Amino acid sequence: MGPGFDFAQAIMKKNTVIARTEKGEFTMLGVYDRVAVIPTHASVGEIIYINDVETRVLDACALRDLTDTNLEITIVKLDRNQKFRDIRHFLPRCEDDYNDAVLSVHTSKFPNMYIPVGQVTNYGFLNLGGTPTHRILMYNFPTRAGQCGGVVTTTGKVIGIHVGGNGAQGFAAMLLHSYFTD
Description:
Structural class: mainly beta
Subcellular location: Host cytoplasm
Subunit structure: Interacts with host IFIH1/MDA5; this interaction inhibits host IFIH1.
Strand order of the largest sheet: 1-2-3-6-5-4
Distance between the termini: 36 Å
PDB class: viral protein
Number of helices: 1
Shape: globular
Protein name: Protease 3C
Largest sheet: 6 strands, antiparallel, barrel
Order of helices and strands: HEEEEEEEEEEEE
Number of strands: 12
Radius of gyration: 15 Å
Catalytic activity: Selective cleavage of Gln-|-Gly bond in the poliovirus polyprotein. In other picornavirus reactions Glu may be substituted for Gln, and Ser or Thr for Gly
Strand content: over 45%
């Protein structure tokens, strides 16, 4: 509908896949080569479904900060026959607040879903499902079950992936350029 939705649609149409684990279906952001991200609570194993194709997981790493605190991001390398468009240049370098973000979701249940979530706070610490978690972004939108893995964008930046909510607010794990240095 506007330049925010334009940037979000460009990311969704080329850099997402539908990931299915034993814990359900997630929006999964592909970042470069065969490297993607997903919320750590997806519990990625040795085999994952990617757009309903049985796919070997070559590596999975649940990220923690240097205080050894959960970040709720898992980086997956997929045994896929095709690379992702490299979008690393759209990742922020530092922790930050943002204006006017869009949360975008694409699953069997919620195809082509785009949400204007508005102002994004660098919230920091959250007790997420009883797990102390750092580098959390907050937005005042009543997000719900099925939106985990959703991509959070501003114009020009891919800033986070949706990981939870409390019924009034939604919470995203930051994406930083330093996670995807090769």
